Symmetry: C3
Subunit: 32 residues, 3 copies
């Protein structure tokens, strides 16, 4: 199971990575 | 411990799911 | 390995925590 769990953690890390970039884009677009 | 760790991973997956939707809403609202 | 995996999960939890706050800021700034 542990390798799969490491898989799942990495899938979450990747989703977070992309979300962080999208948030940054929104932050810039709402900024003055 | 492993079942609890799977729990925690799922709690993070769920938080990511909701954040992704909220980010999408912000993206649309900042869009032209 | 399990302690390290718990580490990694917590690093993701922390990234999510900060992203949630930033999303909230963007939500308020796009709000009427
Ligand atoms: Cl995770
Ligand atoms: Cl956002």
């Amino acid at each position: 199971r542990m390798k799969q769990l490491e898989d799942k953690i990495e899938e979450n890390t990747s989703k977070i990575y992309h979300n962080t970039n999208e948030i940054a884009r929104n932050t810039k677009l709402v900024g003055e």
